[PDB]
């Protein structure tokens, strides 16, 4: 039993034309020898962005300014503490009533989060974009960490019965963290030159959602959802909240900053354009056509139909609202399928994308042009580029030079039959259901830096 | 008053293209104008033809019988 | 024109969309092209476990 | 806390080691990404028209690659499953359940081949698909790929007859399977349809008959018998619709003119499958298989597959799965891989000693793959640092290699499962039989010239 | 009974393609409109005898045990295909001049389930037909053929016209997406039409 | 298109036997257009010069 003393020689003796073509040669880069090259000298540390307007509170908008005196900005996140919720026997639903946090507490309690330079809407996003991005480009291994960061950890979404009932647990008052997806946070090679931008006032505007629609009040028997009231829970509703915006800054060498000071810089960034939501009634017609009016070189399109029967429940893209289940847990009814049956792209009566199935967008496109595949119903994608997550530009067409296109979506028979009521107890569709189609587009842009200022060049 | 059914297009895909002569790749591989279709309807069906492959095979063979004895002697056995 | 099946006749409409942004991002004489991978030779070696 | 106060002491802490690592007049600083232009192109899906035969179970059909394009870089096949409903007048009566086999896709697609106008470019089958998907699975897409191929707990969950408590009927939802080809492995490798007008690129797909696509289990004794048309309502749909789609990409006129009329060379990966070797542990425990491969092999995947029942597939364990509580398929207790040790021999020269099965099971995938299998079996060996890398790594060509043999030692569990006598629901009530399967993944070189393509080295 | 206009039905989205490019495509609505608007009188009886509606295939037949036990006859039927070359003799496809394109015709038939009308005798209701309802089941396979007429010409011009650029004018079809209308809720409906080339006629029906 | 009262009343059911509109009726609008085009034959192939 030879221990690697002649087997290697026997293998190496098998050298022929194919091996000569593949390996060998005077210019072959052998392994086991990695060419090391020097990098820049720098350091990084976190700071807290200084609040510039208002006081944080649910249902209002507050702005925080980017701190100065730094050298680069490449990371930002928002942390906030949630209140402690305790039900009471004096609620309207009585004994048959449960209170729980909505699914995806983060990506909720926030809408139209924007980043602005002086006076211009540089970037903006909201719940639909956050959900689509975190479902399509989620790095595996970090999924559990992201869930523990945002919610859906069986500690917030588990229904809690009234105080007099057997289940008297209170929702813990633990804090939560949400990273801010931005063009300087996408890649380490893209960062804000704070030192090179002294004449711009960089602001981040966050608009929190009302606490009334962030709490789901579920009937234990009939599975009905009603808005919450102050008298239902102890301590009322804490409208005020403590929210803090943290950032990561990086200091570089004096030679580096002097070399990069006083020069013209070109940056390619990513933005978001959200089409207005379209109300869909499958009872009238099974086909819904929505026009798209986009501006720049669109790279990806994410669309889905959201069940919008109640404002309390969020990120519910299936055709039936969730109901309470045995063991004081939330479960999806057996009739929970994506309402979309098929989709089609039309360029002024020119079918570029044929009428293929919904499962195509659901599975095949993410399998080829994304780093992940969604684990929830809905979230249909069409990407013009080879890699959605890559910051380097790939194949993409601009809609500015292109006359308005349209998306055609076909509702499923399950959707059209769940639109009408009549469902029995704990069926989700006991009440009539309403749906809204939402479409989000991701595109490319160019940002120019000179003379201590930033702006979009004429291109 | 007379008819034959051989062909009507002359020498655009020249019949003797498989030999060694000047090439004509600048026309039938690219459409002349935008919207023009691709020119492969009957020409497809003759794979791995042209004398280039045969000459390459002959060049690759040449002296394999006498050159196979050493081969990896300069690469493996110390 | 036709809807159910058109082939690649609709691949020219989106290709014709050119502007200053497209000329800045894509195009050029030095623009690298995908679908064409460059291969470089590596060293000749072998490996196997040993006690 | 102070915002930026300790950000300068770290920079001031500069020494000889820091000067050796960082610094320099040619340092490539971060936060500055160099952007380079890329070629203008567009892509779109397209149906691939079929040219030979019709889509039916047990037969084969050939689908031609669509012409009038510029590049082909993808391929997938969609198929709609029929409706299955058990009838009370079946052979087993009340003691019978019907379910789809585990990994419904990768099954009913065997000998799937790509050919180039006169020659077999490559081919693959069920064992290759299973091994490749277990050893090269990108996590995050694992659940999605499983959903596309089946394994939804709705088709693989056994259902009793209509007269029992479980009246569930298997739904008819279409499934999609990607086709692993050399032009689909990497974006940089694509088929130049515009450059190749003298060839007809064809994909031949042969389906498996529906008799062994369905598992007809007994609830009590856990035995499998072949299905029949009278067993289920409606009948056995021999023919079924199936479509092939692929992505076609267009290129700019200047780029196509530049690339038209040139000589190109590409590196591609194909596979070869040794004939299956039936193994009987009832007489001897050591099994030797000769390997006769052609080109520079990169990896060798070897498994021992239970072949007692043709209805059940992808069963590399020593015991067949059985129906359990909750009307669900389950795996019995003594379900272990038959292989206990393996070795390689190069003309009476033991290259690899009698290594344990756990070596190939865990250690080799841990170091030279992108994933580790989650099912028992699936043993691999690799001559290259990265199996999934398209760029070539260390390997060896078996053509110049003298005769090579692989030796496998069985296990006591395998030799006791081969003989019958197991009690009810043990999974080995009937005697079991096993087949050794060995497959190889290698390299090759293709040449593009004179409006045609071929293999120069052959 | 068989549905009215058995032909012009079971043939939808029939297309003619050059190489792999969709050149023309029509469907049942266009067929009905064209044959009802540009019908040469005198051949109307022949058309209504050759495309079905022969007053025999469309007559309802009761069950076997009822008064009407007649069975719908199995007679072959023919449907001409309206194409740009078939519109006029002067427009003909130069097959001898186009050897590098695969001229092909794609025809999608329709399931026999929705080709047969299963009418209620008294209440006049319609329900889908099933295999067990009729004798012999439903044969998914069927024998259908396509015939085309060719023309041969002498060498005096068949080779002379080759090698020259020829421009021909053809007539195509553009179909707007179908819109569902509910007169109970709305009294008027607006449809946005988008077309490409020089339109000639517009046929709209509900 | 402005609909007719006959269609409005036929959409609702309630008709007696053999009245045609005994069951509720649903209608769909279809619009078809006919257009000219130019097809060019050159070098043994055809294409649309305008597209």
């Amino acid at each position: 039993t030879g221990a690697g003393v002649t087997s290697g020689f026997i293998d190496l003796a098998t050298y022929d034309n194919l091996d000569r073509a593949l390996y060998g040669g005077k210019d072959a880069t052998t392994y086991f020898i990695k060419e090391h090259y020097p990098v820049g000298w720098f350091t990084k540390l976190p700071t807290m962005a200084t609040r510039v307007s208002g006081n944080p509170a649910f249902g209002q908008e507050f702005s925080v300014g980017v701190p100065r005196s730094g050298d680069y900005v490449l990371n930002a996140w928002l942390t906030l503490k949630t209140p402690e919720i305790k039900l009471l026997e004096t609620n309207r639903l009585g004994a048959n009533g449960t209170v729980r946090w909505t699914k995806n507490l983060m990506h909720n309690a926030v809408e139209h989060a924007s980043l602005t330079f002086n006076d211009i809407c540089a970037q903006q996003f909201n719940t639909a974009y956050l959900d689509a991005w975190t479902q399509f480009n989620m790095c595996e291994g970090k999924r559990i960490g992201y869930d523990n960061m945002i919610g859906n950890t069986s500690d917030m979404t588990n229904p809690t019965p009234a105080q007099g009932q057997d289940g008297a647990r209170t929702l813990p008052s633990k804090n939560l963290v949400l990273p801010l997806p931005f063009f300087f946070s996408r890649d380490c090679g893209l960062a804000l030159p704070t030192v090179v931008l002294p004449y711009n006032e960089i602001r981040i505007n966050i608009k929190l959602r009302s606490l009334q629609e962030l709490l789901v009040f579920q009937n234990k028997d009939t599975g009905n959802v009603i808005p919450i009231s102050a008298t239902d829970i102890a301590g009322g509703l804490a409208d005020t909240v403590e929210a803090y915006v943290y950032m990561t800054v990086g200091l570089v060498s004096n030679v580096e900053r002097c070399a990069m000071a006083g020069t013209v810089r070109d940056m390619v960034v990513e933005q978001m354009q959200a089409a207005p939501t379209h109300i869909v009634n499958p009872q009238n017609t099974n086909n819904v056509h929505v026009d798209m009016r986009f501006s720049h070189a669109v790279k990806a399109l994410f669309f889905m139909v959201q069940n919008v029967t109640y404002k309390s429940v969020g990120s519910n893209y299936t055709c039936v609202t969730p109901v309470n289940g045995p063991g004081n847990t939330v479960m999806e009814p057996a009739m929970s399928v994506d309402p979309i049956k098929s989709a089609s792209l039309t360029y002024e009566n020119t079918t570029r994308l044929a009428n293929m199935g919904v499962e195509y967008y659901s599975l095949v496109q993410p399998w080829y042009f994304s780093a992940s595949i969604p684990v929830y119903t809905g979230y249909h994608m069409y990407s013009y580029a080879l890699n959605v997550g890559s910051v380097h530009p790939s194949g993409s067409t601009n809609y500015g030079r292109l006359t308005n296109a349209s998306i055609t979506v076909t509702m499923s028979p399950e959707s059209v039959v769940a639109a009408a009521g009549g469902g029995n107890n704990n069926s989700g569709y006991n009440e009539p259901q309403r749906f809204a189609l939402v479409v989000i587009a991701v595109n490319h842009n160019v940002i120019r830096i000179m003379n201590g200022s930033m702006g979009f060049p004429i291109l | 008053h007379v008819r034959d059914s051989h062909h009507v297009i002359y020498k655009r895909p020249p019949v003797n293209e498989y030999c060694a002569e000047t090439r004509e790749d600048n026309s039938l591989y690219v459409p002349e104008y935008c919207g023009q279709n691709w020119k492969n309807g009957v020409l497809s069906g003759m794979g791995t033809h042209h004398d280039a492959y045969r000459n390459l095979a002959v060049n690759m063979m040449t002296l394999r019988r006498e050159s196979a004895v050493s081969a990896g002697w300069a690469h493996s056995y110390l | 024109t036709c809807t159910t099946g058109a082939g690649v006749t609709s691949g020219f409409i989106d290709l014709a969309t050119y502007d200053n942004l497209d000329r800045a991002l894509y195009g050029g004489k030095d623009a690298t092209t995908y679908f064409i991978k460059e291969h470089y030779p590596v060293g000749w070696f072998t490996k196997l476990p040993t006690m």
Side-chain angles (χ1 to χ4, degrees), chain A residues 1-25 27-34 36-292 294-453 455-459, chain B, chain C residues 1-28 30-37 39-51:
Chain A
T1 74
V5 290
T6 47
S7 313
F9 292 105
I10 287 172
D11 301 348
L12 294 190
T14 72
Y15 200 71
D16 205 31
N17 304 332
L18 182 67
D19 304 319
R20 161 145 51 249
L22 301 184
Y23 318 89
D27 48 357
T29 61
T30 176
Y31 299 92
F32 323 113
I33 301 282
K34 49 182 306 292
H36 166 54
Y37 59 93
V39 309
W41 173 240
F42 73 98
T43 182
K44 65 176 198 40
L45 73 164
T47 62
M48 171 145 48
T50 61
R51 178 191 288 102
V52 298
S53 289
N55 186 282
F58 287 119
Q60 286 84 15
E61 183 178 1
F62 75 108
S63 310
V64 186
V66 164
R68 294 283 182 85
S69 84
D71 210 346
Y72 277 109
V73 168
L74 74 164
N75 174 8
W77 62 96
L78 172 80
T79 185
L80 73 165
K81 184 258 280 184
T82 74
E84 180 95 357
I85 318 290
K86 173 177 175 289
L87 212 48
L88 312 163
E89 304 101 354
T90 74
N91 51 5
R92 308 171 269 206
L93 281 185
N96 269 26
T98 54
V99 65
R100 79 188 193 263
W101 285 109
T102 196
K103 162 192 182 210
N104 276 356
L105 184 48
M106 300 325 268
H107 304 175
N108 294 346
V110 58
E111 49 187 21
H112 177 56
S114 62
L115 165 70
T116 185
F117 293 70
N118 262 334
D119 189 8
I120 193 66
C121 184
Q123 212 164 2
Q124 57 185 313
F125 51 84
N126 59 342
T127 288
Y129 172 79
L130 286 180
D131 291 348
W133 197 255
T134 55
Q135 266 312 291
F136 277 108
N137 284 254
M138 181 78 262
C139 180
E140 201 43 58
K142 297 162 152 174
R143 195 180 294 277
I144 311 299
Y146 200 75
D147 277 21
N148 281 105
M149 264 171 50
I150 62 163
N152 290 318
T153 61
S154 69
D155 292 330
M156 295 296 172
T157 68
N158 265 15
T160 79
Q163 267 315 310
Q165 295 297 127
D166 60 340
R169 74 173 209 85
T170 78
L171 306 173
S173 165
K174 94 198 205 193
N175 55 5
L176 299 175
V177 182
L178 176 136
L180 276 298
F182 281 128
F183 67 95
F184 56 83
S185 167
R186 283 280 266 118
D187 185 13
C188 304
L190 301 178
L192 269 179
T194 290
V195 64
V196 177
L197 294 158
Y199 304 149
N200 292 113
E201 186 187 335
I202 323 299
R203 279 206 186 170
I204 290 178
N205 320 293
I206 309 294
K207 184 178 184 293
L208 306 185
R209 200 168 294 204
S210 164
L211 196 145
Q212 279 83 348
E213 54 207 51
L214 289 157
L215 282 172
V216 163
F217 198 39
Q218 183 82 256
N219 188 283
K220 204 186 308 176
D221 190 22
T222 182
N224 291 19
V225 169
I226 45 172
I228 208 74
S229 46
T231 63
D232 278 357
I233 71 174
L237 275 69
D239 203 1
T240 180
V241 70
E242 43 176 3
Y244 304 104
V245 182
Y246 290 86
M247 281 209 210
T248 306
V249 297
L251 277 297
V252 306
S253 59
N254 199 8
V255 62
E256 195 166 318
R257 92 179 70 213
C258 203
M260 66 94 56
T263 176
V264 172
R265 166 138 180 76
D266 277 331
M267 291 195 38
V268 58
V269 307
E270 302 265 358
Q271 292 181 357
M272 191 285 258
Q273 324 172 96
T277 175
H278 204 116
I279 312 296
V280 169
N281 200 347
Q283 280 281 349
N284 278 320
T285 177
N286 289 43
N287 298 321
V288 182
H289 65 279
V290 186
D291 199 302
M292 281 96 78
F294 298 142
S295 302
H296 303 107
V298 62
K299 201 167 46 73
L301 279 81
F302 318 103
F303 60 94
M304 61 285 278
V305 161
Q306 152 168 20
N307 173 280
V308 71
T309 80
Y310 325 118
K311 42 182 192 52
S312 299
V313 298
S315 278
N316 187 44
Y317 295 127
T318 175
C319 70
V320 158
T321 61
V323 306
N324 191 288
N328 305 319
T329 189
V330 57
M331 61 66 78
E332 329 288 348
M335 183 177 176
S336 187
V337 293
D338 46 351
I340 292 301
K341 180 67 174 66
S342 177
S344 296
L345 269 60
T346 305
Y347 293 0
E348 71 156 50
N349 203 356
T350 314
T351 302
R352 179 216 194 279
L353 183 63
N355 196 299
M356 311 155 198
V358 58
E359 298 309 281
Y360 166 79
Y361 311 102
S362 183
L363 313 169
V364 182
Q365 279 266 299
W367 165 265
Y368 286 118
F369 311 107
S370 87
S372 162
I373 281 179
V375 287
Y376 295 112
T377 78
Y379 311 102
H380 323 104
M381 182 179 72
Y382 182 77
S383 75
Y384 287 80
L386 317 177
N387 213 8
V388 174
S390 171
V391 76
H392 206 50
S394 307
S396 64
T397 80
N398 48 0
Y399 280 11
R401 203 196 163 102
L402 187 144
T403 310
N404 54 89
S406 66
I407 187 67
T408 316
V409 291
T410 313
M411 310 327 278
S412 68
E414 293 83 3
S415 160
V416 71
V417 72
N424 58 5
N425 283 338
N426 270 7
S427 52
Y429 69 115
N430 180 214
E431 285 85 53
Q433 314 269 318
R434 314 171 277 283
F435 310 91
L437 161 62
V438 293
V439 179
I440 316 290
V442 176
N443 56 356
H444 280 321
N445 285 292
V446 165
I447 289 182
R448 180 66 61 85
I449 312 295
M450 51 185 98
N451 309 330
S453 56
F456 294 95
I458 296 181
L459 272 194
Chain B
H1 42 297
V2 290
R3 188 194 193 279
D4 52 2
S5 47
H6 289 119
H7 212 268
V8 295
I9 301 151
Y10 264 50
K11 299 288 96 176
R12 297 284 296 177
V15 193
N16 73 77
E17 51 76 20
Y18 40 71
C19 295
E21 77 272 12
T22 176
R23 304 273 75 80
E24 197 268 332
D25 50 1
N26 268 322
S27 87
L28 73 165
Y29 298 172
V30 298
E32 297 91 1
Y33 59 93
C34 194
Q36 171 86 260
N37 222 315
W38 277 251
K39 294 181 176 67
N40 53 3
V42 166
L43 295 204
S44 84
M46 303 176 288
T48 62
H49 84 292
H50 198 295
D51 299 338
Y53 293 101
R54 301 178 162 75
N55 291 343
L56 183 63
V58 178
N59 189 359
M60 287 265 295
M61 181 145 268
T62 184
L63 271 173
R64 260 190 63 82
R65 175 79 156 202
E66 274 90 12
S67 285
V69 287
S70 56
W73 285 353
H75 298 281
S76 172
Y77 303 118
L78 276 297
Chain C
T1 318
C2 51
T3 66
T4 61
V8 298
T9 190
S10 166
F12 297 125
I13 288 163
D14 63 341
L15 200 79
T17 48
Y18 280 17
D19 78 325
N20 302 343
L21 188 41
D22 288 322
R23 294 311 110 201
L25 292 189
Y26 318 86
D30 46 3
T32 186
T33 174
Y34 293 152
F35 302 99
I36 296 189
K37 187 190 78 81
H39 171 259
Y40 58 102
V42 304
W44 170 245
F45 76 102
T46 190
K47 64 173 195 46
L48 73 164
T50 43
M51 211 55 168

